[PDB]
Design an enzyme around this catalytic site. Structure first.
Site, PDB file in Angstrom:
ATOM      1  N   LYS A   1       0.858  -1.218   0.000  1.00  0.00           N
ATOM      2  CA  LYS A   1       0.000   0.000   0.000  1.00  0.00           C
ATOM      3  C   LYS A   1       0.882   1.252   0.000  1.00  0.00           C
ATOM      4  O   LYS A   1       1.986   1.201   0.576  1.00  0.00           O
ATOM      5  CB  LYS A   1      -0.943   0.009   1.207  1.00  0.00           C
ATOM      6  CG  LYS A   1      -2.058  -1.030   1.146  1.00  0.00           C
ATOM      7  CD  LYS A   1      -3.424  -0.507   1.552  1.00  0.00           C
ATOM      8  CE  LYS A   1      -4.023   0.452   0.541  1.00  0.00           C
ATOM      9  NZ  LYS A   1      -5.442   0.749   0.850  1.00  0.00           N
TER      10      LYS A   1
ATOM     11  N   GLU B   1      14.795  -2.089  -6.982  1.00  0.00           N
ATOM     12  CA  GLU B   1      14.535  -3.371  -7.685  1.00  0.00           C
ATOM     13  C   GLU B   1      13.463  -3.136  -8.753  1.00  0.00           C
ATOM     14  O   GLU B   1      12.399  -3.755  -8.738  1.00  0.00           O
ATOM     15  CB  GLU B   1      14.209  -4.475  -6.673  1.00  0.00           C
ATOM     16  CG  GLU B   1      15.464  -5.089  -6.043  1.00  0.00           C
ATOM     17  CD  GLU B   1      15.310  -5.775  -4.688  1.00  0.00           C
ATOM     18  OE1 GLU B   1      14.279  -6.461  -4.496  1.00  0.00           O
ATOM     19  OE2 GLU B   1      16.240  -5.644  -3.819  1.00  0.00           O
TER      20      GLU B   1
ATOM     21  N   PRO C   1      21.985 -10.383 -11.080  1.00  0.00           N
ATOM     22  CA  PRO C   1      21.840 -10.335 -12.532  1.00  0.00           C
ATOM     23  C   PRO C   1      21.413 -11.636 -13.216  1.00  0.00           C
ATOM     24  O   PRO C   1      22.090 -12.062 -14.103  1.00  0.00           O
ATOM     25  CB  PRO C   1      23.246  -9.900 -12.963  1.00  0.00           C
ATOM     26  CG  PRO C   1      24.130 -10.579 -11.963  1.00  0.00           C
ATOM     27  CD  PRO C   1      23.394 -10.390 -10.654  1.00  0.00           C
TER      28      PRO C   1
ATOM     29  N   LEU D   1      19.332  -3.909 -16.781  1.00  0.00           N
ATOM     30  CA  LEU D   1      20.527  -3.108 -16.406  1.00  0.00           C
ATOM     31  C   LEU D   1      21.262  -2.607 -17.664  1.00  0.00           C
ATOM     32  O   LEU D   1      21.685  -1.445 -17.677  1.00  0.00           O
ATOM     33  CB  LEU D   1      21.467  -3.941 -15.530  1.00  0.00           C
ATOM     34  CG  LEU D   1      22.773  -3.239 -15.183  1.00  0.00           C
ATOM     35  CD1 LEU D   1      22.511  -1.987 -14.397  1.00  0.00           C
ATOM     36  CD2 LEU D   1      23.690  -4.170 -14.407  1.00  0.00           C
TER      37      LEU D   1
ATOM     38  N   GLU E   1      22.504  -2.666  -1.695  1.00  0.00           N
ATOM     39  CA  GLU E   1      21.721  -3.365  -0.643  1.00  0.00           C
ATOM     40  C   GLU E   1      22.121  -4.845  -0.657  1.00  0.00           C
ATOM     41  O   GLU E   1      21.991  -5.519  -1.698  1.00  0.00           O
ATOM     42  CB  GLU E   1      20.227  -3.199  -0.946  1.00  0.00           C
ATOM     43  CG  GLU E   1      19.325  -3.740   0.134  1.00  0.00           C
ATOM     44  CD  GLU E   1      17.858  -3.772  -0.286  1.00  0.00           C
ATOM     45  OE1 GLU E   1      17.321  -2.719  -0.735  1.00  0.00           O
ATOM     46  OE2 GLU E   1      17.259  -4.836  -0.176  1.00  0.00           O
TER      47      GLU E   1
ATOM     48  N   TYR F   1      17.150 -12.923   2.306  1.00  0.00           N
ATOM     49  CA  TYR F   1      15.994 -11.985   2.183  1.00  0.00           C
ATOM     50  C   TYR F   1      14.814 -12.555   2.991  1.00  0.00           C
ATOM     51  O   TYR F   1      15.042 -13.515   3.744  1.00  0.00           O
ATOM     52  CB  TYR F   1      15.718 -11.651   0.720  1.00  0.00           C
ATOM     53  CG  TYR F   1      15.314 -12.804  -0.149  1.00  0.00           C
ATOM     54  CD1 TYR F   1      13.996 -13.232  -0.172  1.00  0.00           C
ATOM     55  CD2 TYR F   1      16.235 -13.461  -0.953  1.00  0.00           C
ATOM     56  CE1 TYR F   1      13.603 -14.302  -0.955  1.00  0.00           C
ATOM     57  CE2 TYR F   1      15.855 -14.530  -1.747  1.00  0.00           C
ATOM     58  CZ  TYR F   1      14.533 -14.948  -1.745  1.00  0.00           C
ATOM     59  OH  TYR F   1      14.127 -15.999  -2.505  1.00  0.00           O
ATOM     60  N   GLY F   2      13.616 -11.963   2.901  1.00  0.00           N
ATOM     61  CA  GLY F   2      12.524 -12.180   3.871  1.00  0.00           C
ATOM     62  C   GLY F   2      12.904 -11.712   5.271  1.00  0.00           C
ATOM     63  O   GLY F   2      12.491 -12.312   6.239  1.00  0.00           O
TER      64      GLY F   2
HETATM   65  O1  LIG Z   1      14.784  -8.778   3.414  1.00  0.00           O
HETATM   66  C1  LIG Z   1      14.181  -8.594   2.372  1.00  0.00           C
HETATM   67  O2  LIG Z   1      13.386  -9.441   1.929  1.00  0.00           O
HETATM   68  C2  LIG Z   1      14.459  -7.335   1.640  1.00  0.00           C
HETATM   69  O3  LIG Z   1      14.309  -7.604   0.250  1.00  0.00           O
HETATM   70  C3  LIG Z   1      14.707  -6.588  -0.628  1.00  0.00           C
HETATM   71  O4  LIG Z   1      14.327  -7.070  -1.914  1.00  0.00           O
HETATM   72  C4  LIG Z   1      14.022  -5.271  -0.296  1.00  0.00           C
HETATM   73  O5  LIG Z   1      14.754  -4.249  -0.973  1.00  0.00           O
HETATM   74  C5  LIG Z   1      13.987  -4.984   1.201  1.00  0.00           C
HETATM   75  O6  LIG Z   1      13.123  -3.894   1.417  1.00  0.00           O
HETATM   76  C6  LIG Z   1      13.517  -6.192   2.016  1.00  0.00           C
HETATM   77  O7  LIG Z   1      13.495  -5.999   3.460  1.00  0.00           O
HETATM   78  C7  LIG Z   1      12.310  -5.355   3.984  1.00  0.00           C
HETATM   79  O8  LIG Z   1      11.136  -5.905   3.371  1.00  0.00           O
HETATM   80  C8  LIG Z   1      11.028  -7.304   3.630  1.00  0.00           C
HETATM   81  C9  LIG Z   1       9.863  -7.796   2.824  1.00  0.00           C
HETATM   82  O9  LIG Z   1       8.708  -7.261   3.445  1.00  0.00           O
HETATM   83  S1  LIG Z   1       7.348  -7.595   2.816  1.00  0.00           S
HETATM   84  O10 LIG Z   1       6.285  -6.894   3.576  1.00  0.00           O
HETATM   85  O11 LIG Z   1       7.101  -9.058   2.853  1.00  0.00           O
HETATM   86  O12 LIG Z   1       7.393  -7.184   1.394  1.00  0.00           O
HETATM   87  C10 LIG Z   1      10.881  -7.556   5.125  1.00  0.00           C
HETATM   88  O13 LIG Z   1      10.731  -8.955   5.381  1.00  0.00           O
HETATM   89  C11 LIG Z   1       9.455  -9.266   5.943  1.00  0.00           C
HETATM   90  O14 LIG Z   1       9.361  -8.816   7.285  1.00  0.00           O
HETATM   91  C12 LIG Z   1       8.062  -9.034   7.876  1.00  0.00           C
HETATM   92  C13 LIG Z   1       7.875  -8.319   9.204  1.00  0.00           C
HETATM   93  O15 LIG Z   1       6.711  -8.034   9.565  1.00  0.00           O
HETATM   94  O16 LIG Z   1       8.863  -8.023   9.917  1.00  0.00           O
HETATM   95  C14 LIG Z   1       7.862 -10.534   8.078  1.00  0.00           C
HETATM   96  O17 LIG Z   1       6.538 -10.735   8.611  1.00  0.00           O
HETATM   97  C15 LIG Z   1       6.176 -11.896   9.394  1.00  0.00           C
HETATM   98  O18 LIG Z   1       6.448 -11.766  10.802  1.00  0.00           O
HETATM   99  C16 LIG Z   1       5.589 -10.935  11.608  1.00  0.00           C
HETATM  100  C17 LIG Z   1       5.892 -11.192  13.068  1.00  0.00           C
HETATM  101  O19 LIG Z   1       7.304 -11.364  13.152  1.00  0.00           O
HETATM  102  C18 LIG Z   1       4.109 -11.181  11.358  1.00  0.00           C
HETATM  103  O20 LIG Z   1       3.353 -10.268  12.161  1.00  0.00           O
HETATM  104  C19 LIG Z   1       3.890 -10.994   9.862  1.00  0.00           C
HETATM  105  O21 LIG Z   1       2.503 -10.947   9.497  1.00  0.00           O
HETATM  106  C20 LIG Z   1       4.670 -12.133   9.199  1.00  0.00           C
HETATM  107  N1  LIG Z   1       4.339 -12.237   7.757  1.00  0.00           N
HETATM  108  S2  LIG Z   1       4.809 -13.661   7.139  1.00  0.00           S
HETATM  109  O22 LIG Z   1       5.830 -13.412   6.099  1.00  0.00           O
HETATM  110  O23 LIG Z   1       3.649 -14.364   6.539  1.00  0.00           O
HETATM  111  O24 LIG Z   1       5.420 -14.533   8.172  1.00  0.00           O
HETATM  112  C21 LIG Z   1       8.073 -11.247   6.747  1.00  0.00           C
HETATM  113  O25 LIG Z   1       8.286 -12.610   7.096  1.00  0.00           O
HETATM  114  C22 LIG Z   1       9.298 -10.764   5.958  1.00  0.00           C
HETATM  115  O26 LIG Z   1       9.244 -11.162   4.591  1.00  0.00           O
HETATM  116  C23 LIG Z   1      12.110  -7.006   5.839  1.00  0.00           C
HETATM  117  O27 LIG Z   1      11.909  -7.171   7.226  1.00  0.00           O
HETATM  118  C24 LIG Z   1      12.331  -5.535   5.500  1.00  0.00           C
HETATM  119  N2  LIG Z   1      13.654  -5.046   5.960  1.00  0.00           N
HETATM  120  S3  LIG Z   1      13.732  -4.387   7.434  1.00  0.00           S
HETATM  121  O28 LIG Z   1      15.099  -3.948   7.765  1.00  0.00           O
HETATM  122  O29 LIG Z   1      13.358  -5.393   8.423  1.00  0.00           O
HETATM  123  O30 LIG Z   1      12.668  -3.304   7.416  1.00  0.00           O
END
Ligand SMILES: O=C(O)[C@H]1O[C@@H](O)[C@H](O)[C@@H](O)[C@@H]1O[C@H]1O[C@H](COS(=O)(=O)O)[C@@H](O[C@@H]2O[C@H](C(=O)O)[C@@H](O[C@H]3O[C@H](CO)[C@@H](O)[C@H](O)[C@H]3NS(=O)(=O)O)[C@H](O)[C@H]2O)[C@H](O)[C@H]1NS(=O)(=O)O
Ligand SMILES: *[C@@H]1O[C@H](CO)[C@@H](O)[C@H](O)[C@H]1NC(C)=O
Ligand SMILES: *[C@@H]1O[C@H](CO)[C@@H](O)[C@H](O)[C@H]1NC(C)=O
Ligand SMILES: *[C@@H]1O[C@H](CO)[C@@H](O)[C@H](O)[C@H]1NC(C)=O
Ligand SMILES: [Cl-]
EC number: 3.2.1.166
Lengths: 385, 74
Positions: free
Chosen positions: A3, A67, A113, A121, A185, A190-191
């Site tokens: 969003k 990205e 890549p 790129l 980055e 990831y995740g």
């Molecule tokens: O780490 C990455 O994946 C990074 O990937 C690059 O491609 C991006 O440039 C970079 O921004 C990414 O890191 C940031 O975004 C990640 C992806 O977020 S997204 O909303 O899925 O699109 C993020 O990773 C996610 O973090 C979530 C979180 O809420 O902290 C995780 O959520 C799970 O856990 C919580 C409780 O712990 C729960 O309440 C959620 O509903 C649950 N969702 S679940 O996936 O179904 O389990 C999620 O697991 C995870 O994918 C990175 O945290 C974020 N970077 S930052 O430094 O942490 O902000």
């Protein structure tokens, strides 16, 4: 899942003052998905931000998009690299007309890549490569959800980074020869990182190896995801406690110089014993021009003993060996430097980083699953002076 | 035998990295945390950040392309 959200002048102020007070140079990523009627970049929100940062005298560098290779998947919008190149040309015109007309611009912050990413790129650097100061791309080894302990210790996983770096330089050298290449980055997984892995002593193998290969292969800047945040790959947790990768990063900052050299192991089995060599950092008060910093990773399950070549065999060496504080071994969130736990003296004071002088002529001991820096004092390397 | 000979190339720099070679990010995601101001205000955190000076601090991530500047918001 994704969003639109707003941020305030206050937020900008929080971000800039953190960087300014910390002695860091802020790079701010602008929203690339603000699109006109015919998928041209709409620069009007960026104009509002540029004016305001100018009006406060904030010296900021810029990116546009994160990205872009996955915009279709994220927002059902496809922007080709040519259009993205034109978008960067338009942002560059706005910076030139701003109060900071020399402000740097980096992009395009593509993923690793893959074929479709390499195509984007290439078309980006053909169209917009003239206005960027450095090419940025991103790298993660693993999916945090599935990553195992064994992956974090696996030379076969570490070595995949090498071919990603080779493909990036193949695209850059075919379009903008000599343009600087940055990891904009990067982390272990990831995740948000691998639970109980990305925030531990075990995360250190991937982080130190990536730094060693990046420096060795011609990458100029490596940006660690993340200093602080929700993800397990943070250098500092939400309780403001430093994790082992913070301490590793701080030792690297204090000991490792800008001039990259080379080390390799005879018998040429560069798998589990990984070695990197730079000139010592001259900002380090303890050391002097001509000194060498060796760093070594041992992914063997036994101690290895490293012998320095002539003419360095009998030099005084300072050891900086990192081991986990027990009882969680490689999954520990606490690290010891030469047997002393690394802990802040108080909220305002980092501890001293105490070296262990080795007896001259001795072999360099590197325990199983460990990493160490070694400073070769009075090396007198002309390349380093 | 667990003894290993190193070979060094020392005749000239093979590359020059930035003094900011080891840099760091803050994910765009963090600016949606209600406690953004408290978190980046932490003087403990600024002490830790200053130890990695000189460095770039890149503010970006997936949310980069879902964040809109609003001059009215508080
Ligand atoms: O780490 C990455 O994946 C990074 O990937 C690059 O491609 C991006 O440039 C970079 O921004 C990414 O890191 C940031 O975004 C990640 C992806 O977020 S997204 O909303 O899925 O699109 C993020 O990773 C996610 O973090 C979530 C979180 O809420 O902290 C995780 O959520 C799970 O856990 C919580 C409780 O712990 C729960 O309440 C959620 O509903 C649950 N969702 S679940 O996936 O179904 O389990 C999620 O697991 C995870 O994918 C990175 O945290 C974020 N970077 S930052 O430094 O942490 O902000
Ligand atoms: C760009 O965005 C602004 C603000 O959201 C909008 O009012 C304007 O009409 C847009 N411009 C174009 C050329 O689509
Ligand atoms: C890239 O996208 C633009 C805008 O959608 C389009 O007009 C152009 O033809 C595309 N370029 C290529 C080379 O496909
Ligand atoms: C190291 O790994 C080998 C190969 O699986 C194993 O059999 C050996 O006993 C291990 N040694 C130690 C010291 O753990
Ligand atoms: Cl230096």
């Amino acid at each position: 899942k994704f969003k639109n959200s707003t941020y305030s002048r206050s937020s900008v102020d929080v971000l800039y003052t953190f960087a300014n007070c910390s002695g860091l140079d802020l790079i701010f990523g602008l929203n690339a998905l603000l699109r006109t009627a015919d998928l041209q970049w709409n620069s009007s929100n960026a104009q509002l931000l540029l004016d305001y940062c100018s009006s406060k005298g904030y010296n900021i560098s810029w990116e546009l998009g994160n990205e872009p290779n996955s915009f279709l998947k994220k927002a059902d919008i496809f922007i080709n690299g040519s259009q993205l190149g034109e978008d960067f040309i338009q942002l560059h015109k706005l910076l030139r007309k701003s109060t900071f007309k020399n402000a740097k611009l980096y992009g395009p912050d593509v993923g690793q890549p893959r074929r479709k990413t390499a195509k984007m790129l290439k078309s980006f650097l053909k169209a917009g490569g003239e206005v960027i100061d450095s090419v940025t791309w991103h790298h993660y080894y693993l999916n945090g959800r599935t990553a195992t302990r064994e992956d974090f210790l696996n030379p076969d996983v570490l070595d995949i980074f090498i071919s990603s770096v080779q493909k990036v330089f193949q695209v850059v050298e075919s379009t903008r020869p000599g343009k600087k290449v940055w990891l904009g980055e990067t982390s272990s997984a990831y995740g948000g990182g691998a639970p109980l892995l990305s925030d531990t002593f075990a995360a250190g193998f991937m982080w130190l190896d990536k730094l060693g290969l990046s420096a060795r292969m011609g990458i100029e800047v490596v940006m660690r995801q993340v200093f602080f945040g929700a993800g397990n790959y943070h250098l500092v947790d939400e309780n403001f406690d430093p994790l082992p990768d913070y301490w590793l990063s701080l030792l690297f900052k204090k000991l490792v110089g800008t001039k990259v050299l080379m080390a390799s192991v005879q018998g040429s089995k560069r798998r589990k014993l990984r070695v990197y060599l730079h000139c010592t950092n001259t900002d380090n008060p303890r050391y002097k021009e001509g000194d060498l910093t060796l760093y070594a990773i041992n992914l063997h399950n036994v101690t290895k003993y490293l012998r320095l070549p002539y003419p360095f065999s009998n030099k005084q060496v300072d050891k900086y060996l990192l081991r986990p504080l027990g009882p969680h071994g490689l999954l520990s969130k606490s690290v010891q430097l030469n047997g002393l736990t690394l802990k802040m003296v108080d909220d305002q004071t980092l501890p001293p980083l105490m070296e262990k002088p080795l007896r001259p002529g001795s072999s360099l001991g590197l325990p199983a699953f460990s990493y160490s820096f070694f400073v070769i004092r009075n090396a007198k390397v002309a390349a380093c002076i | 035998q667990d003894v290993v000979d190193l070979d060094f190339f020392t005749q000239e720099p093979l590359h020059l990295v930035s003094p900011s070679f080891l840099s760091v990010t803050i994910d765009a995601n963090l600016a949606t945390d209600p406690r953004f101001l408290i978190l980046l205000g932490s003087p403990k955190l600024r002490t830790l950040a200053r130890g990695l000076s000189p460095a770039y601090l890149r503010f970006g991530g997936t949310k980069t392309d879902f964040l809109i500047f609003d001059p009215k918001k508080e």
